[PDB]
């Protein structure tokens, strides 16, 4: 690589990658472990305009990488001694989409809705996220609005159900600020056909019954966007051979 390309890769590692790795290695959602990544620290890195990443891109790559809405669009034409690493472009666009959806205020925060679904052998369901409760009884579904994160002394998410043949059983109890994200990960997820900004969620309970819900988002994938951080790696280079 040229020394301009090389010193830019080195600046990228020292100014951004090393401290991202120190802050988020061996932490949920990056790794499926009990220890949680700090949401305010994650905001300090990926914030749309003030984030450490956005500031690095603006200070060092303003001539070859440009903003277009929530996207970063490359332009290495006329800079023939530079070819972007595709993993770099993909990583920054993944983080920009997460920031656009979940960090609009400069901190973690979004709103979404849930509607309890129906399934054979399921009489009642209870979903809780950050002390916000959705209790489904009498085959009477309602859309309920939720905040994530929500201020509470009990952060986390839980899911329980009453089958037609047994008393209440607990599906999962996931404490901490990422509780909702940990719960969503366990569901079978897909676009809900015929539901605007809708996603079907289906948790296979311990008795084999399906715990169904519809998620409705305000922008993009809503809270599902945070699942893009599962096994996410910030690349060590901006430019490649």
């Amino acid at each position, epitope marked *: 690589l040229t020394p301009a390309a090389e010193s830019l890769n080195a600046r990228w590692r020292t100014a951004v990658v090393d401290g991202w790795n120190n802050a988020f290695s061996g932490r949920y959602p990056f790794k499926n472990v009990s220890s949680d990544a700090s949401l305010p620290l994650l905001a300090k890195y990926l914030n749309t305009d003030t984030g450490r990443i956005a500031r690095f891109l603006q200070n060092n790559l303003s001539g070859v990488l440009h903003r277009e809405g929530s996207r970063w669009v490359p332009d290495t034409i006329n800079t023939r001694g530079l070819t972007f690493n595709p993993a770099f472009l993909k990583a920054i666009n993944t983080l920009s989409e997460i920031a656009d959806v979940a960090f609009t205020t400069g901190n973690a925060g979004l709103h979404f809705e849930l*509607r*309890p*679904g*129906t*399934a*054979a052998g399921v009489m009642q369901t209870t979903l809780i996220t950050d002390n916000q409760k959705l209790i489904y009884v009498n*085959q009477m*579904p309602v859309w309920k609005r939720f905040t994530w994160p929500a201020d509470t002394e009990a952060p986390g998410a839980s899911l329980s159900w009453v089958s037609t043949q047994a008393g209440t059983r607990q599906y999962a109890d996931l404490p901490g600020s990422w509780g909702l994200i940990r719960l969503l990960e366990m569901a079978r997820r897909k676009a*809900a*056909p*015929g*539901v*605007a*900004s*809708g996603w*079907s969620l*289906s948790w296979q309970a311990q008795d084999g019954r399906m715990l*169904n819900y*519809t998620l*409705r988002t305000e922008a993009g994938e809503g809270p599902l966007v945070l699942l893009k951080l599962r096994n996410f790696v910030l690349p060590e280079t901006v430019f490649e051979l």
Partner: nanobody
Amino acid sequence: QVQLVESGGGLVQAGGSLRLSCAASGFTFEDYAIGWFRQAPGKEREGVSCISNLDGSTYYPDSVKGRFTASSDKAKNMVYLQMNSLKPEDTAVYYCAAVNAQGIYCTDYIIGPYGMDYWGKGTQVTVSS
């Protein structure tokens, strides 16, 4: 309060036709989608049709597609289910149900896991051979 009153049920010979009516009241008709569902003994309730008064979308599962037609009459606030070429598999209690049509379009998901907002009491349909 929403009211959904089904009528037109009864005994019909296999190969015959039957027209079901769902008299709707207590909601802004244009804002809702109406689903027809059926439940027979030893069977889970299943959706057979969806019609949205809001966008005009319709859905029918393959079991009844081409044989059953749902139509909406804004002048009378009624939804019909025209059932042709009736089979013994069509015997069940038929229910009409309503769901807010804002933000949706008729699909298998709507009359599947999504859930309805209001339900009628149902009408018996018996196909005799």
